[PDB]
Design a protein around this ligand. Structure first.
Ligand code: SPV
Ligand code: MN
Length: 615
């Protein structure tokens, strides 16, 4: 077979055999094993510069940073091309796209046969979770994209140290990726190779992941969504733990007590902002620290507590909207050593995106930019056509250790105990600012039934309300109704210890007024809601019983430093009977679709809410 160039530190016979089999199938010109060093990163970045995929940014303005721009067909996740190919269709469920595995294997084999002709196969070894810790799991991604290799170096623990952990017999998650654009001898490549035809396929029984045609984000960085959510949710369902689309933060009040909170918001609905929240005026003595902004692996312990870890090593965050008001910790994080994707280029070799003008003199747009499609951009063009200099799904990739607010336990494999869960969709109407569930079952209900308006994080029409249970609609690895039962069963195990269960909240930062603008100021002001949750955790916070749960009164929040009247508070906390009667009918349609294995407790909770609305 082809010379694999297998390094001497690879002692795993089964792994080498697997690579040999994949090289026989994909037929790359050469094979390169990524060792994960900083020196290699710089070499691969310089290689990307030569290919035109990367532009190096001005070293004086943005040290050791690069900008990539993608093909306009390859800018986001493609949910319609993402499949869970379980042996039985009922174990994919109605929220997933399924195909008989042998039938998908016959569909993909011609696509991957020779997919890497004219290209290099990069072997990308990685650990999700701290290296060699009891909770970590190892993957190997074979890819023909050097863009994948360098982004994986930031987002995971990548490289030769993985093989010390694997040893001769360790198991691993097998991942194969190709941009699906094989090159003929002497053929000129493009700056962003991709294919109009795309598949992102998961075989849960074998833990296999196959990705074809996209080089972008969660389609191609296979440790992040494919492994650490879709495959990991199957593993945790069988082994007693959870893999969740949740940030994890720590918060310390002036008396020095520290709590931790996990929040599930859908894609591009404020996780990165909340996980790095800076307390505003009126909260002297409070501090917020980040454990993670996207993925949480959680399991119960004998002491009755729920322990969470962040399995990633960096941030892959939405760029537009980031500035010193909305997320200063993130602004400081991306001062250097960052990869930017699909943002705009300034005349001085820096980057720009919509929202940055809030920090500019006169809050004014730049005079001239090159947009993410390479076209000239000016404020006049933006005024007359609304052209976006940065694509709405543009991204920064940056190490977690760049974050000034990073928690000291961010990479502690013992985890942090979770004192409260938060669920929240992007809802222009109906859902109030914050509600505490009356019981664990009612909390699971609120998580199961949450809705959210679609965003640019996946292709398709943005701004449409859809059901997104637990913010896991694009990421649940098995039948969504069985997952609801898993959460119910987890609560029973915790309660049997005698412990008090974590509280569950529903939030909504995104109610709109008649002009389409947000009625709640949000961002740093979200601390005022978080501090009520802390009060409630301590047993010191008051609240009123409403239809959907317990909500604070105006006098229960701290308004020092914010001019927000009791009338504006009533607007974002009033439970509107008609809006909720309509909302509960949309829950019934969900329950009809998820009828198979749907826990009876959800129907019972719905009937109790229906009674409270008709009272
Ligand atoms: O869309 C999301 O939820 C993300 O975190 C971005 S991606 O990794 O899916 O590209
Ligand atoms: Mn995400």
């Amino acid at each position: 077979g082809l010379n694999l160039n297998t390094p001497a530190y690879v002692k795993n016979a089964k792994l080498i055999a697997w690579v040999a089999d994949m090289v026989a199938l994909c037929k790359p010109d050469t094979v390169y094993w990524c060792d994960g060093s900083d020196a290699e990163y710089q070499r691969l970045c310089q290689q990307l510069v030569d290919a035109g995929t990367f532009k190096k940014l001005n070293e004086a303005k943005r040290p050791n940073s690069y900008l990539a721009c993608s093909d306009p067909s390859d800018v986001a996740r493609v949910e319609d091309r993402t499949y869970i190919c379980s042996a039985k269709e009922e174990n994919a469920g109605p929220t997933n796209n399924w195909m008989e595995p042998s039938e998908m294997r016959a569909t993909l084999q011609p696509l991957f046969d020779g997919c890497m002709r004219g290209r290099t196969m990069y072997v990308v070894p990685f650990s999700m979770g701290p290296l060699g810790s009891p909770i970590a799991h190892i993957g190997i991604e074979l890819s023909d994209s050097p863009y994948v290799a360098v982004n994986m170096k930031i987002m995971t623990r990548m490289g030769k140290a993985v093989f010390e952990v694997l040893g001769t017999e360790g198991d691993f998650v097998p991942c194969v990726h190709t941009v699906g654009a094989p090159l003929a001898e002497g053929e000129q490549d493009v700056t962003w190779p991709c294919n109009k035809t795309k598949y992102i396929v998961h075989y849960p029984e074998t833990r296999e992941i196959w990705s074809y045609g996209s080089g972008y984000g969660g389609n191609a960085l296979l440790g992040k969504k494919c492994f650490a959510l879709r495959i990991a949710s199957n593993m945790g369902r069988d082994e007693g733990w959870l893999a969740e689309h949740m940030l994890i933060l720590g918060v310390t009040n002036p008396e020095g007590k520290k709590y931790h909170v996990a929040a599930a918001f859908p894609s591009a609905c404020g996780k990165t902002n909340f996980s790095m929240l800076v307390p505003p005026a009126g909260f002297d003595g409070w501090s917020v620290t980040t454990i993670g902004d996207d993925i949480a692996w959680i399991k119960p312990a004998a002491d009755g507590k729920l322990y969470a870890i962040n399995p990633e090593a960096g941030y892959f965050g939405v760029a537009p909207g980031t500035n010193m008001l909305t997320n200063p910790n993130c602004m400081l994080s991306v001062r250097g050593n960052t990869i930017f994707t699909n943002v705009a280029l300034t005349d001085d070799g820096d980057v720009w995106w919509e929202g940055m003008e809030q920090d500019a003199p006169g809050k004014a747009l730049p005079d001239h930019l090159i947009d993410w499609q390479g076209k000239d951009w000016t404020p006049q063009i933006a005024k007359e056509t609304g052209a976006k200099a940065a694509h709405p799904n543009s991204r920064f990739t940056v190490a977690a250790t760049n974050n000034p607010a990073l928690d000291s336990a961010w990479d502690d494999p013992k985890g942090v105990a979770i004192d409260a869960f938060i669920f929240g969709g992007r809802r222009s109407t109906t859902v109030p600012l914050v509600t505490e569930a009356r019981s664990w079952v009612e909390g699971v209900y609120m998580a199961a039934t949450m809705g959210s308006e679609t965003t640019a994080a996946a292709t398709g029409q943005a701004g449409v309300v859809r059901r997104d249970p637990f913010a896991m609609l694009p990421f649940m690895g098995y039948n969504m109704s069985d997952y609801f039962q898993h959460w119910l069963d987890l609560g029973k195990k915790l309660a049997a210890s005698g412990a008090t269960l974590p509280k569950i909240y529903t939030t909504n930062w995104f109610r709109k007024g008649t002009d389409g603008k947000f009625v709640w100021p949000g961002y740093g002001e979200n601390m005022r809601v978080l501090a009520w949750m802390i009060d409630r955790i301590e047993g010191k916070g008051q609240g009123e019983d409403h239809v959907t749960g317990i909500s604070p009164s105006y006098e229960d929040l701290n308004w020092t430093g914010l001019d927000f009247s009791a009338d504006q508070f009533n607007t974002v906390t009033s439970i509107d009977k008609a809006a909720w009667l309509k909302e509960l009918e949309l829950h019934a349609e969900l329950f009809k679709q998820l009828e198979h294995h749907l826990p009876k407790e959800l129907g019972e909770t719905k009937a109790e809410i229906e009674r409270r609305l008709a009272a």
